[PDB]
Amino acid sequence: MNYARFITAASAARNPSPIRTMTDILSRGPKSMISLAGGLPNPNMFPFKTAVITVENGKTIQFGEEMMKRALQYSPSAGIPELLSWLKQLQIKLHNPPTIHYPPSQGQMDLCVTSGSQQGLCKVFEMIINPGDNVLLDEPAYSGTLQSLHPLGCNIINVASDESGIVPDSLRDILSRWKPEDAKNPQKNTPKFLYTVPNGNNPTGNSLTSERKKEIYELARKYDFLIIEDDPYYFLQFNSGRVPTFLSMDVDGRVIRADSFSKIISSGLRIGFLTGPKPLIERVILHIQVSTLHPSTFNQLMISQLLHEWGEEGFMAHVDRVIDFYSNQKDAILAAADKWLTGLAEWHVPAAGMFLWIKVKGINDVKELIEEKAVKMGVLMLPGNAFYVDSSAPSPYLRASFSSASPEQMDVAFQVLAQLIKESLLVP
Amino acid sequence: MNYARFITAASAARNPSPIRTMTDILSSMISLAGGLPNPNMFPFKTAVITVGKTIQFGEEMMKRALQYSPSAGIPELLSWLKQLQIKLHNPPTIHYPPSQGQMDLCVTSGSQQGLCKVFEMIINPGDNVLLDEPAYSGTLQSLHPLGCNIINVASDESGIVPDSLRDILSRWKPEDAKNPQKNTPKFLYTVPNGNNPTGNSLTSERKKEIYELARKYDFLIIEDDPYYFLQFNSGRVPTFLSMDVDGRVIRADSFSKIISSGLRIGFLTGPKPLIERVILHIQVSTLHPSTFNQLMISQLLHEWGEEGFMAHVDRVIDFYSNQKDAILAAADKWLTGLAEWHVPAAGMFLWIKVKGINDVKELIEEKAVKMGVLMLPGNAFYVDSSAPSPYLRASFSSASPEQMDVAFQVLAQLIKESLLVP
Ligand SMILES: COc1ccc2cc(NCc3c(COP(=O)(O)O)cnc(C)c3O)c(=O)n(O)c2c1
Ligand SMILES: COc1ccc2cc(NCc3c(COP(=O)(O)O)cnc(C)c3O)c(=O)n(O)c2c1
Numbered sequence: 077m078n079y080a081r082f083i084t085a086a087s088a089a090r091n092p093s094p095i096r097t098m099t100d101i102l103s104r105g106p107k108s109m110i111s112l113a114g115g116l117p118n119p120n121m122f123p124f125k126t127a128v129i130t131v132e133n134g135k136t137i138q139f140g141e142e143m144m145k146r147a148l149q150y151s152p153s154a155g156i157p158e159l160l161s162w163l164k165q166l167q168i169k170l171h172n173p174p175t176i177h178y179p180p181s182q183g184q185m186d187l188c189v190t191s192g193s194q195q196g197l198c199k200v201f202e203m204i205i206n207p208g209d210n211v212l213l214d215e216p217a218y219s220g221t222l223q224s225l226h227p228l229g230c231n232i233i234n235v236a237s238d239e240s241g242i243v244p245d246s247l248r249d250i251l252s253r254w255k256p257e258d259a260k261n262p263q264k265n266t267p268k269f270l271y272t273v274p275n276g277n278n279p280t281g282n283s284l285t286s287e288r289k290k291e292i293y294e295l296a297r298k299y300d301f302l303i304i305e306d307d308p309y310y311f312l313q314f315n316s317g318r319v320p321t322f323l324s325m326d327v328d329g330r331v332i333r334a335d336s337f338s339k340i341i342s343s344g345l346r347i348g349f350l351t352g353p354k355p356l357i358e359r360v361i362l363h364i365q366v367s368t369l370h371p372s373t374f375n376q377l378m379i380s381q382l383l384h385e386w387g388e389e390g391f392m393a394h395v396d397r398v399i400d401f402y403s404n405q406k407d408a409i410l411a412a413a414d415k416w417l418t419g420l421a422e423w424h425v426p427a428a429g430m431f432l433w434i435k436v437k438g439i440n441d442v443k444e445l446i447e448e449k450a451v452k453m454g455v456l457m458l459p460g461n462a463f464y465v466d467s468s469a470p471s472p473y474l475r476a477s478f479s480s481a482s483p484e485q486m487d488v489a490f491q492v493l494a495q496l497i498k499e500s501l502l503v504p
Numbered sequence: 505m506n507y508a509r510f511i512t513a514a515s516a517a518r519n520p521s522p523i524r525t526m527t528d529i530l531s532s533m534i535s536l537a538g539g540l541p542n543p544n545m546f547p548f549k550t551a552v553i554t555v556g557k558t559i560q561f562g563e564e565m566m567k568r569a570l571q572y573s574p575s576a577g578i579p580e581l582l583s584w585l586k587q588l589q590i591k592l593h594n595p596p597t598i599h600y601p602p603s604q605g606q607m608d609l610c611v612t613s614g615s616q617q618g619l620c621k622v623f624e625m626i627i628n629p630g631d632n633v634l635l636d637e638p639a640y641s642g643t644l645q646s647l648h649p650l651g652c653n654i655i656n657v658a659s660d661e662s663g664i665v666p667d668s669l670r671d672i673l674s675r676w677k678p679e680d681a682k683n684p685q686k687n688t689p690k691f692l693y694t695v696p697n698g699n700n701p702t703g704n705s706l707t708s709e710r711k712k713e714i715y716e717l718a719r720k721y722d723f724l725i726i727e728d729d730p731y732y733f734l735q736f737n738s739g740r741v742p743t744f745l746s747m748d749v750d751g752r753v754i755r756a757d758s759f760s761k762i763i764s765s766g767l768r769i770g771f772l773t774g775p776k777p778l779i780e781r782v783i784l785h786i787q788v789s790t791l792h793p794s795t796f797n798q799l800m801i802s803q804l805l806h807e808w809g810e811e812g813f814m815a816h817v818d819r820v821i822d823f824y825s826n827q828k829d830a831i832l833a834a835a836d837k838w839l840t841g842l843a844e845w846h847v848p849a850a851g852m853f854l855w856i857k858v859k860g861i862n863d864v865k866e867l868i869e870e871k872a873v874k875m876g877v878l879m880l881p882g883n884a885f886y887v888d889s890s891a892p893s894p895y896l897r898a899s900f901s902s903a904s905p906e907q908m909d910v911a912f913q914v915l916a917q918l919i920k921e922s923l924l925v926p
Pocket of ligand 2: 191192193194195218220273278306308335336337338343347348523537538539540572573790791
C-alpha cells in the first residue's frame with residue numbers, strides 16, 4: 077500500500093520552505109549559532125509583555141517575559157513540540173494505534189496541530205481530491221465537509237445510515253459495482269476514501285458500533301480506500317465505556333483521524349490535530365506552511381500549559397464534568413420533545429455530541445417553517461436541507477442543539493415548534 | 505470590472521454556511537441552531553495581559569474570546585482596520601456599489617492565508633501570472649503547485665522596471681484580455697516596500713506606470729505589503745490601493761512585522777466580490793481567525809488609539825533603521841571588495857551578491873552552518889531554485905551589531921577560502 081495513488085499531483089510536488097530546510101541543518105551544526113536567516117520580528121519590540129490566565133480548578137497559567145516573546149513569535153508549521161509530544165502520548169494511551177512503530181514509508185503514526193479540526197479536514201480533502209474522484213459518506217453529514225467537498229468536483233456517493241451510523245450492508249452493495257482488483261487500476265475510479273463522524277454524527281447524534289467499524293474497516297482494506305475519521309465529539313460520548321476508534325484498529329495505515337479541542341476546551345482558540353500515516357501528515361504540514369504558516373503560538377502554549385498541569389488524570393476529570401453537563405442537557409431536550417413533540421415528530425436518544433435530529437411527521441419541507449415562521453417567533457434551529465449534498469431538495473428534518481439553552485428555553489422553543497407544525501398540518 | 509474572469513468555477517461554486525444564511529434572515533430569542541460549546545464549560549476564566557498599561561478579559565470577554573466568531577473577523581477589529589485603510593490610503597473604491605468592487609476587508613490568519621486564498625480563487629492550471637524575481641519564497645511555493653506559468657518581470661534598485669512589464673505585455677494586444685483563449689495575465693504580484701529578499705521599494709512614478717499597464721491589459725494587482733510600516737525613507741510612497749480607481753487591487757497587510765507574528769493576524773483589502781470569495785474559502789478551511797488573538801489586538805488598539813499605534817510604528821521604524829545601519833557597517837568592514845549590496849529602502853533584509861562565486865548554496869548550506877552562522881541562499885527566491893545563485897539574504901531584524909560583525913567576519917573568511925583556490 078503506497079500513498080501515491082490517493083494524493084493529487086499538486087500535493088506530491090509541494091516542497092518545504094527554505095527555513096524548514098535550514099531548521100534540519102540547524103540541528104546538524106554547533107551550539108554557538110548566529111542567525112541572520114529569518115524575517116522574524118525582533119522579540120523585544122512586541123507590545124505585549126506578560127500574561128496571567130485563570131483556570132477554574134487548576135493552577136493559574138503564567139507567561140513570563142521570555143515565554144511571552146516565544147508566544148508572540150513564529151513557530152513550527154506542525155505545532156510546538158511540547159503540545160505535539162503530549163498529544164502523541166494521548167493518542168497512544170487512548171487508541172494504541174498499530175502504526176506507532178511502523179517505518180515512516182509504511183505509514184508510521186504522525187501528528188500535526190491544525191487551526192481547528194476544520195483545517196485538518198480541508199487540507200486532507202485538497203491533498204486527495206482530483207475532479208471526478210469518487211468519495212463515500214453517509215448523509216445527513218456535517219455541512220462544513222459538504223461545502224469543502226462540493227467545489228473540489230468529486231462525486232459524493234451516499235452510504236445508508238440508521239440509529240447505529242453507516243449500515244455496512246449499504247457500503248458492501250455500493251462497492252459491489254467494482255471488483256476488489258479495480259483499486260489497482262486508476263481508470264476504474266474506485267473510491268478514494270470513506271468519510272465518517274463515528275461519535276454523535278453532525279447532525280444525527282448517532283454513533284457507530286465496534287462491530288460495524290470492524291466491518292467498514294474490512295471493506296476499506298478489500299477495496300483499498302482511506303478512512304477519514306472526523307471525531308470532534310469523541311470526548312462527548314454519553315454511553316458507558318468508549319467504543320474503539322478506526323485509528324485503534326488501523327493495521328494498514330489507512331486511517332486519517334481529525335480531533336478537536338473546540339467541543340471540550342475552546343472553539344475560539346482554533347486548535348485541533350490530525351493523526352495519520354507519516355507520508356500523508358507530511359503533505360498536510362506542507363500545505364499548512366503555505367496557507368496559515370502555523371497555528372497560533374500563543375493559543376498552543378495556553379493549551380499546552382493547561383494540558384501539562386492537568387496530566388492525563390486532570391484532562392479526563394474535565395471530560396467527565398463536560399459529559400455530565402451535556403448528558404443533563406440531552407435529558408432536558410428529550411423531556412421538552414416528549415412534552416410538546418409526541419405525535420408530531422420522530423426522534424431517538426443521541427449517543428454523543430450536542431444535537432437532537434427530529435423528523436417532522438407530515439411535512440415534506442421544513443425550510444419555510446424554520447426559516448420564516450420560527451424566526452418571526454424568536455426560535456432558531458437548522459433545517460435538514462443544510463446537511464445533504466442536494467440542499468435544494470425538501471427535508472422533513474431539523475437539527476436542534478442542546479449545548480447552551482436552558483431546560484425552560486427548550487420548553488418554550490418546542491412549544492413554539494409544536495404550535496407552528498400543528499398550524500402547517502391543519503392547512504388543507 | 506468583470507470579476508468573473510478572475511474567479512475559478514470552484515471559487516464561484518462556493519456558498520455561505522447555513523449559520524451565515526440563518527443570521528442574515530434575523531431582524532428575545534432562543535437559539536438551538538449552532539454547534540457551539542457551552543460558554544460556561546471553558547477551563548480559562550479571565551486574563552490579564554501587560555502592555556505599564558494592562559489589557560483585561562473579564563469573565564464575559566473571556567467566554568467570547570474562547571468561542572466561535574464570524575469568518576471575516578470580529579466587527580470591532582474590522583471597523584478599526586477599515587478606518588485605518590481609509591485614513592492611510594483613502595481608496596477610490598470606498599463608496600462604489602458592491603458589484604463595481606466596493607472596498608471590503610477581512611481578517612486572515614496572517615497575510616500568508618490571504619495570499620494563498622487569493623491565488624486559489626484566481627488560478628486555473630496554465631494561467632499566466634506576472635511577478636519580479638527574486639520574490640518571497642512563500643508565494644513561489646504557493647503558486648508552483650497551482651500549475652500557473654510564472655512570467656518574470658525585470659526589477660532594479662527601485663523595484664519592477666515598467667519598461668520590462670511593457671515589453672512582456674507587448675506579446676498580446678490590449679483587446680486580447682476580452683478573449684479567454686488568448687490567455688492574458690490574470691495578475692501582477694508585488695511586494696512594493698522592502699521586497700523579500702531584495703529590500704528594494706517601488707517609487708510613486710513606477711506604481712502609476714504599472715497601474716496604467718494593469719488597466720490597459722486588464723489584470724489585477726496583488727499588493728503584498730507586510731513591510732509597509734517598516735519604511736526607512738521620509739514620507740511614505742502612495743500604495744497601489746490609494747490609486748485603485750478601477751477596483752483591480754487586492755492588498756495584503758500583516759501585523760506580523762509590527763505587532764506579533766505568532767498571533768497569526770493579517771488582513772486583506774480589495775473589491776467586495778473578490779473579498780467575498782476569500783471569506784467563503786476561509787469558512788471551509790480555518791472557520792475564522794482566533795477570537796482570542798483578535799480580541800488581544802482589538803483591546804490593544806482600543807487602549808492605544810490611532811496615536812499609540814502610530815507612536816509604536818515610529819519606535820519600530822527607529823529600531824530597524826538602527827539595525828539596518830549596524831548590518832551596513834558590518835558589511836562595509838568585512839565584505840568590501842568581496843561582495844555587492846546597496847541600502848535597503850524598507851523591511852528587515854540585506855541582499856548581498858558574492859563577487860566571484862557562481863553558486864553560494866554550498867557556502868551557506870554547508871560551510872556557514874558548520875561555522876555557526878545562518879543565512880539564506882538566493883536559490884530559495886527564484887522559480888528555478890535549482891539554478892546557481894551568487895546571492896544571499898541576511899536579515900537584520902534580531903541579531904545584535906556585534907553578532908553581525910562576527911557573522912560577516914565568518915562570511916568574509918568563507919568567501920576568501922572559496923576564491924583563493926585556483
Ligand atoms: C521560522 O522562520 C520564519 C518564519 C516565518 C517567516 C516569514 C517571512 N515572511 C513573511 C511574509 C509574508 C507572510 O507573513 P505573515 O503575514 O506572517 O503570514 C507575506 N509576504 C511577505 C513578502 C513575507 O515576507 C520570512 O521572510 N521569514 O524568513 C520567515 C522565517
Ligand atoms: C457560529 O456558529 C457556528 C460556528 C461553528 C460551528 C461548528 C460546528 N461543527 C464543527 C465541526 C468540525 C469543525 O470544528 P473545529 O474543530 O472547531 O474546526 C468538524 N467536524 C464536525 C463534524 C463538526 O461538527 C457546527 O456544527 N456548528 O453549528 C457551528 C456553528
